[PDB]
């Protein structure tokens, strides 16, 4: 036997997934997104007001980039188009204290507000390296958005679009 479950499911995203995408980045090119999250078909996801992030963004040589580096998470509709109305987590890089901030409640950096993502809506991770620094690599890097295993932290909430009657409403929301 297995216990029944709701459509709502509590998860934590990261790099090595199919629907997410990434790419390397060079210094002084903030408009290049190093991560491109991308709505799966028939799967809405949701983020409440505060959820952790593990912005692990290191060098080719396995070193966190310059502390003057900055990270900007940002919502995007289709058309590959950024958007100002809707944006999360404008912050620096050399602040997080990686080794513990994936763990402790206190370091743990939550979002600015909530979010919703229809069956195809994009999110991007712009990375402002100032200039003349070391380039970015992804294989020596990670990223996350949730704390689903633990008991104090929050997690990302996924739902299958078929299991709702308000899907048209959220589609109008966009």
């Amino acid at each position: 036997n297995i216990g029944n479950l709701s459509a709502e499911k509590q998860i934590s995203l990261y790099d090595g997934q199919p629907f997410i995408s990434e790419q390397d980045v060079a210094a002084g090119d903030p408009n290049t997104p190093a991560l491109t999250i991308e709505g799966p078909d028939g799967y809405v996801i949701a983020v409440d007001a505060g959820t952790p992030i593990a912005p692990e963004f290191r060098d080719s040589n396995g070193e966190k980039l310059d502390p003057s580096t900055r990270v900007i998470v940002q919502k995007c509709d289709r058309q590959g188009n950024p958007l100002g109305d809707g944006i999360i987590f404008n912050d620096t890089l050399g602040r997080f204290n990686y080794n513990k901030m994936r763990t402790d409640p206190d370091y743990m950096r939550k979002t600015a507000k909530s979010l919703m993502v229809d069956e195809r809506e994009i999110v991007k991770v712009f990375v402002d390296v100032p200039d003349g620094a070391n380039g970015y690599d992804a294989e020596r890097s990670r990223f996350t958005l949730g704390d689903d295993t633990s008991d104090f932290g929050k997690a990302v909430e996924i739902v299958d679009h078929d299991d709702l009657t308000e899907g048209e409403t959220q589609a109008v929301k966009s």
């Binding site: 036997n1 297995i2 216990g3 499911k9 990261y14 090595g16 020596r140 295993t149 104090f152 996924i158």
Partner: protein, 229 residues
């Protein structure tokens, strides 16, 4: 008549016959199985409940490193390293992230310093030309899931569809109330409805080598359960 109990990577409530251990596939990454849990002769059922029940899992890999007359003291690893609970200070990691052992000299090999996210290490000692050393760093950058079997191999499916990563596993300090792990899932399985853990990762895994110093068992998995007798 419901009593909580604990499982292991070895024997215990299964006699090392209703359990198995196994390595994984590396060249093609596959979400393979490393460990099972067959119900033994006796029990009526077993129950797992994430968000109520605990878990522990300490995975390590293996390699082989020679030495040289002008020995290096330095190594690189194709397996990303992180701390466990806090800093990378080997004195106070709550268990080391690396173990080493010279083969010629049947003795440990202590560490001096770690190139942290570079995934390289400096040692304390000086190996010799043609001298073999075995290492056991921890395993990161890999998923994990649970599933179930209907007495043959016909899977019911999976406990909880979404995976969980192992660098994260190391990160959360085990041994602390609240900071413990409690996954999501709720299941039950009777006689011969075995369970199998699954892992998808590039790197290998190691349960035993017969030369690992610290207690015959390179890795482990341990777990809590609620059993009907």
């Amino acid at each position: 008549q419901t009593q909580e109990y604990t499982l292991s990577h070895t024997g215990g409530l299964l006699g090392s016959s209703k359990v198995t251990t196994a390595s994984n596939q590396t060249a093609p990454q596959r979400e393979t199985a490393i460990i099972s849990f067959e119900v033994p002769r006796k029990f009526s059922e077993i129950e797992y409940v994430g968000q109520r029940d605990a878990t522990r899992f300490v995975p390590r890999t293996t390699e082989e490193i020679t030495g040289t007359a002008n020995d290096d003291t330095v190594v690189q690893l194709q397996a990303n390293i992180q701390p466990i609970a806090g800093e990378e200070d080997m004195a106070d990691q709550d268990y080391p992230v690396v173990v080493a052992y010279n083969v010629t000299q049947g003795a440990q090999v202590e560490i001096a310093d770690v190139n942290y996210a570079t995934d390289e290490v400096t040692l304390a000692t000086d190996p010799a030309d043609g001298d073999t050393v075995k290492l056991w760093p921890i395993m990161g950058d890999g998923e994990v899931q649970f599933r179930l079997v209907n007495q043959f191999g016909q899977e019911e499916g999976r406990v909880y569809p979404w995976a969980t990563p192992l660098y994260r596993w190391h990160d959360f300090p085990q041994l602390k109330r609240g900071r413990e792990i409690n996954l999501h899932g709720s299941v039950t399985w009777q006689e011969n409805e075995t369970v199998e853990v699954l892992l998808d990762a590039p790197q290998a895994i190691t349960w035993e080598d017969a030369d690992y110093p610290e207690g015959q068992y390179v890795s482990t998995f341990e777990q809590d359960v609620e059993i009907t007798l």
